[PDB]
Amino acid sequence: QCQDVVQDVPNVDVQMLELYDRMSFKDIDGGVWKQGWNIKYDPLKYNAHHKLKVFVVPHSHNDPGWIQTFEEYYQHDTKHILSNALRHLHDNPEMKFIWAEISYFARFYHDLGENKKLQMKSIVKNGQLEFVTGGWVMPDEANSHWRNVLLQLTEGQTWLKQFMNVTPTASWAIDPFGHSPTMPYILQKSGFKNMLIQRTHYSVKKELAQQRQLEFLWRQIWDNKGDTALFTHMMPFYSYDIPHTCGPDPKVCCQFDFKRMGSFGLSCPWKVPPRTISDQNVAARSDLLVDQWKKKAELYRTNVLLIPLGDDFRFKQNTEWDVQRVNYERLFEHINSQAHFNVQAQFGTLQEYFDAVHQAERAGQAEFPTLSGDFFTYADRSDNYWSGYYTSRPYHKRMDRVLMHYVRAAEMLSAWHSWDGMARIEERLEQARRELSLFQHHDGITGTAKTHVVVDYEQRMQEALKACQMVMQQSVYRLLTKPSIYSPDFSFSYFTLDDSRWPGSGVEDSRTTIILGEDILPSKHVVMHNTLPHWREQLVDFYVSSPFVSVTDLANNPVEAQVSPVWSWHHDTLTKTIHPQGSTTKYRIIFKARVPPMGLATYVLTISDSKPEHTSYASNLLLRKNPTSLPLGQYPEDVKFGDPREISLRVGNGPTLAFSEQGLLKSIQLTQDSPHVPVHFKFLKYGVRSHGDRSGAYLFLPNGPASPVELGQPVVLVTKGKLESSVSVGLPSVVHQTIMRGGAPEIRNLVDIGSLDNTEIVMRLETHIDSGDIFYTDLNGLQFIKRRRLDKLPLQANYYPIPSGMFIEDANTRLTLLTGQPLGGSSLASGELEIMQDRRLASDDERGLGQGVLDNKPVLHIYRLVLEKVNNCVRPSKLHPAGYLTSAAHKASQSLLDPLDKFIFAENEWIGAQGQFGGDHPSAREDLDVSVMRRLTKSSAKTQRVGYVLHRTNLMQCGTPEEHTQKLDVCHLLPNVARCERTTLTFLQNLEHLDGMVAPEVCPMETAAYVSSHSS
Ligand SMILES: O=C(C[C@H]1CC[C@@H](O)[C@@H]2[C@H](O)[C@H](O)CN12)c1ccccc1
């Protein structure tokens, strides 16, 4: 049935980790093709019965924000490009054009008059204008979560289906900075047949070109059978621009970019300009151009050649359309009429190219190699590895993951009902999806845009968060109020969201205090939501105006609680120390919430005049020389003081953690009898080179290994409670916190790099684990890939994206660090893990951004740290390119990315309140998630439709007996099901009509989509 993703090592022609081990990566001058060799071809290869078919594919790369905002580019460039494409393609039936970015296209189309909409639909229907990929954006592939890659793909393609009646099956990704196999994974499950990529390491292009392995069937690293494979074309040269797309010699190709003759303010840096094609020069010009084409064709296996013709924001001016088209038409007429060339050249689209390639394949002309692996870390030249953008602008990288979750929760909570149009649910959800989708752009989440553009993305995301909050709180009010009492005002805030980790303590004072008092309000209802499809317990905290608060469930059962102070860290500009101050009027109450699968649970907080029976109070110990008093108002336990010292803590039956006198972890002891395993946190700094190339938003070019941050004698705060304990320390640039709740600790870093120019702050873990040169990092939150540190490459080449987690292991022990935000990281020595926190860079790094990164702001990074024994786990063999999490590590990752949501009832009394929603929802096996639940129809549809994306991960078997869980059938989650269909992941095509209206669960590492239809 299901493929075994652990025990069967796939047999592929190219496995990227193996290729990396063998490659020497020498950076030699290849001649005119600087990173290749002088290509030779046999002129007799092509003849009358075997011609070279050349497709020249006009394109225009349009960034949804980079050096200008989305709206600035739309007004100055993109609207003109699309208007002139419409005119020119209409008037010139053989001209072609491809378009990728649907965020821009949708904007443009909705502003067109009906006559022009109709003209536009006609040039799409007739194949002159072709959509490629059809996502909202062309996303980053390093930092993006797979859930958001799917979200933006779906946003663009849903628009295209509705308005253009087309769904692209070929993908075009010419600009992301390195490439991930998560893309073919999602695309192949969304109807695609082909994809194109460009930015891969120059040494990889050379190696694959030598073997004609630039076109390959790209399968997942664990896929033994090959069912995931997607045909992939990798472009061979340094850029997608015209000089690097006609052939190997850019001095020649630049002469065929007819926008470079002077009047457009462009020129050829190789110092030979284009010349207008005429009858007196066409034979000579054609002989140069065809020679470049035949050289490029040597790198590929069929007689069908792809020649992109475009660059950034091209095809704007009418005069530009004319100059490119007329000159190429003259070349085509000459070349195609001169038999000695044995070439047929024409304008074409991307799909036309791929169709012709597969026709050649089926005619027996070519067989294609199989490939697995990824294409990180990219370098475009010399030692310029693009690992900096794995960290750049980390505040917005963290915001991405918060908004990811809020979009999921808003779509899920509101999916349970149909809503009247006056509720503006669909409106707010569309806004949220579109702003999050926009940020997936390869200058958004990457942190590679100008400062004012970053500000625009942030503002858009804030509006999206507010939209999600509105939808979430309206939904909770409807789900938990007696139906005959429910009386909604769709503009009113029935609940406010309380989020403890965004923007976070020390970043924004954004959270509301629950204000209780005998003379104002005795009690307050709070509600937790659990988006995951299994019962979940999690500690939750709220701010309250008294320490004398107790918690009950709605059946009035007492719930054990802990009260702790509200501590804020202050950079004291008088004493020159970083130290905590406690509130004397706000307090934190903490208790364990238990919430049904995809459900809600209500609790009540009640004030009393004295310490409640079921509430305890944490102790607090401030470790520093030269302490001063720390009053805490009504808080019943006095703060204690001491000189810095080592300390040890244990919460519940969980691990015992030991800390240095500097407040940093030194060891973890898993159980009572077990060893104190050395696990040391350390903060270090990288700098920038004083000669040669400088680090910037894209490039990490360190001036050697990192140097320790000088810590001085930092102030350490120890809070010890029955439910939660923590150690926090004010270090230079980081308030570092280790929080213990009875399992793997949570780490929070409040990172403020301040004015430290040309500094990158790294957090490192040092252990004994005999990992050697092996470590594992994830791709897009979807899969873990084996990495091998290569000392033959520079330090920055050994940095990889850490979009959600990383681990090291030996035969016996594993250490996994899970993240709540994408950051860059590595293992630079056996037993180590490290992850960059922020970077502040004064210089531009010559990739067009035209600024350094000097707009840092405080960010709260979150993590879980899981030390485990793995000697009993069934792991892949030494040759398998994947790794897999344990149950504990996977749940830890879910605790960061999809925590419980917390709602505080706004008014004094909630009439008709109910205690729970979803108690009857199936509690699915732990490896299964309902990644997306989305109602697909508005309230006017007679047949309601609800879409589900189901993802099953793969967890290691380590000898923990499986407990019976319930089968999850998403098609019966809503009543009155009339049909259940398996669909593509975008919901746009029905693939299977399902027997008995039952949606089967999916196999390990598989993702499926289902749509249920309800007659209601
Ligand atoms: O590669 C680029 C720019 C590429 C890659 C980085 C990315 O931020 C930008 C924008 O997305 C543009 O689309 C071009 N991209 C470059 C190279 C040399 C000089 C100037 C620019």
Ligand SMILES: *[C@@H]1O[C@H](CO)[C@@H](O)[C@H](O)[C@H]1NC(C)=O
């Ligand atoms: C859209 O797609 C196909 C081919 O263009 C056509 O048969 C159909 O009539 C068009 N319109 C629809 C499905 O509304």
Ligand SMILES: [Zn+2]
């Ligand atoms: Zn770009």
